[PDB]
Amino acid sequence: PPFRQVGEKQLPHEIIFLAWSPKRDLIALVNKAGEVLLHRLANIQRVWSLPPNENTGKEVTCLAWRPDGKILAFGLADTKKVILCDVEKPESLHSFSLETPISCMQWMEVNVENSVLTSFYNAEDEANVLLPKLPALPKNYTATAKIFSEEKSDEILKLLGDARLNALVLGGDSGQIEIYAYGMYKIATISEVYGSCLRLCLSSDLKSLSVVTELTTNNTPEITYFQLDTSLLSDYLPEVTRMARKFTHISTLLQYLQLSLTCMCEAWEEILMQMDSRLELQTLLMNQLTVKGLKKLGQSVESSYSTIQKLVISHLQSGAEALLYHLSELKGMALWRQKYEPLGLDAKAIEDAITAVGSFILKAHELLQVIDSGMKNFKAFFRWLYVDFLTEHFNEAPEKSLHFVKRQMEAIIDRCLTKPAQIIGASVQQKRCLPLYQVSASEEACPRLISLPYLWNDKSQNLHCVMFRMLESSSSKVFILRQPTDLSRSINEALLAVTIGSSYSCLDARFYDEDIITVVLRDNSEPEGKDRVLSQLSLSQLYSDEETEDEFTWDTSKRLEEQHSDIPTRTVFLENQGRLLENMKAHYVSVNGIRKVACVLSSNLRHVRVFEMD
């Protein structure tokens, strides 16, 4: 009676990751076969299926929904790469390699939109609408993915989302963390934890980065909570936002320049292959090649030259011009020092990079001069065989350091991009480390990324929250640890053990709306034990110091499991005692607060039951 059944489907293969789209009623899931599939809310209809291929990663470990729900990113542990693809088309729009194999993923965006941040968004929105679009790259067989192909609305304006800073944070099996702005610019590489990145959470204010890690040991892994001080990204937020944005533009270009140079080099290889296939003398020439065959070779060489000329006079000229534009502005920012210097922006490094772009466009101009001088001799040769002219006929019978200038250019651009990631990564300190518990024999049954502990941001009160199960201490109790984003702040009820009731045992719990959490429970009745409902977190927090104690009395050098005896116990009550029950063996949920949707995955059976909370 409380919630409405929308669909019920038995998935062919087991599911290792479940996630809802933040803006649409779509659910992304990993199929344990390494395939990622999309499903609609109504009757859980399969939208698409992305097969796992050896070419672009086989083992996919996690997913991430971009706040602007048009782009979906997923990490591959085997090939050590993150591939960003559209939600409508299976095709990948972007890809990048990672230092360590992926463990977990998070795609978040800043909740702060104060004064100068608003002035920046408006400026970037007006910059992109004013600056002329780059010339359309021709549809070539050598051109892979074809993002710059220009068909209706371009994918480059989709890849680069809103000016509002969104970060894609990646976790490793070693504990290494990587933060990618707009899901493409590396802001920080953090290596301050010990286990394998189980859960990741960057705060909306960018003050802290909480992480839950599963440390592998001889008998059973040890679940440990950590909190990192990423406050530099908070203090210099409008600068970090603008800085990363210009780097995503310089990353889009250079790649555009390389792809256009690839199309230019391939068109040159098409002339040399056709020339090699073509080339007493009077009889042999007319027998080897017909008079009709010279005409088809004439157009093929003329069309390839025109495209080569267009690629360097239009694509390369506008490409380098836009590169000179975005770098020149980055220097103007870099010249502040008070701002951008403690962020790692070196004016001299980019100044030298401008000259590198200038030397490249000039060397490309010098390369065209060689092609034009070579084509004028061929023009006199072609017209002579059909019917200044005689001189060019005699003279008739990568290169010119272009590979060197492109490498020197991308070398200085990369030094401009790498310096901030090194110094921002140096600024972040490990301020909190809380060993929780050691995994039980039963917890090793379900996948890492579906089960509890559950890390969430709580953007309303700015609190890093964790809901975990310590089975060795208690079988029916759910533990809730909440720490503020600003570490200097002292929180009231830092840790509690909530007994949920009756409904007794809590299997899975997930954040839904402002103060309420969705919860899957195990009732006293034996036939139908599995039942889902929403719980109000307001009942336990108490927001007042009890006997001048904020539960800071526990030893953070010893596991919290060891000191469970003196933990502050609480008893929470449900909105409906017997809300929605199901004949299936539930155990897990995936929810979306604003879209009022839910996805109940069955324990091991991988049968899914969807319900709308509206």
Residue numbers in the entry: 2 to 280, 309 to 416, 443 to 452, 511 to 614, 628 to 740
Paper text:
The anaphase-promoting complex/cyclosome (APC/C) is a large multimeric cullin-RING E3 ubiquitin ligase that functions to regulate cell cycle transitions by ubiquitinating specific cell cycle regulatory proteins and targeting them for proteolysis by the ubiquitin-proteasome system. Only four subunits are directly involved in catalyzing protein ubiquitination (the cullin subunit Apc2 and the RING subunit Apc11) and degron recognition [coactivator subunits (either Cdc20 or Cdh1) and Apc10]. The remaining 85% of the APC/C mass corresponds to scaffolding subunits, of which seven are large multiple repeat motif proteins (Apc1 and Apc3–Apc8). Seeking to obtain insights into these structures at atomic resolution and to assist in the interpretation of cryo-EM reconstructions of the APC/C complex, we determined the crystal structures of full-length Apc4 and the N-terminal domain of Apc5 (Apc5N).
We first determined the crystal structure of Xenopus laevis Apc4 (residues 1–741 that lacked the C-terminal 48 residues that were predicted to be disordered). The protein was overexpressed in the insect cell/baculovirus system and the structure was determined using phases to 3.2 Å resolution derived from multiwavelength anomalous diffraction. Tracing of the polypeptide chain was guided by selenomethionine anomalous signals. Apc4 adopts a bi-domain architecture, dominated by a 360-residue seven-bladed WD40 β-propeller domain (Apc4WD40) split by the HBD (Apc4HBD) predominantly composed of four long α-helices. Apc4HBD is inserted between strands C and D of blade 4 of the WD40 domain, extending away from the wider lower surface of the β-propeller such that, together, the HBD and WD40 domain generate an L-shaped molecule. A second smaller insert between β-strands A and B within blade 3 of Apc4WD40 contacts Apc4HBD. Finally, an insert between β-strands C and D of blade 6 forms an edge β-strand (βE5) with β-strand D of blade 5. Apart from these three insertions, Apc4WD40 resembles a canonical β-propeller architecture as judged by its similarity with other WD40 domain proteins (high DALI Z scores). To our knowledge, the insertion of a helical bundle domain within a WD40 β-propeller domain is novel. Human and X. laevis Apc4 are also very similar, differing only for residues 120–130 (X. laevis Apc4 numbering) within the shorter WD40 insert that is an α-helix in the X. laevis Apc4 structure in contrast to a predominantly disordered loop structure in human Apc4.
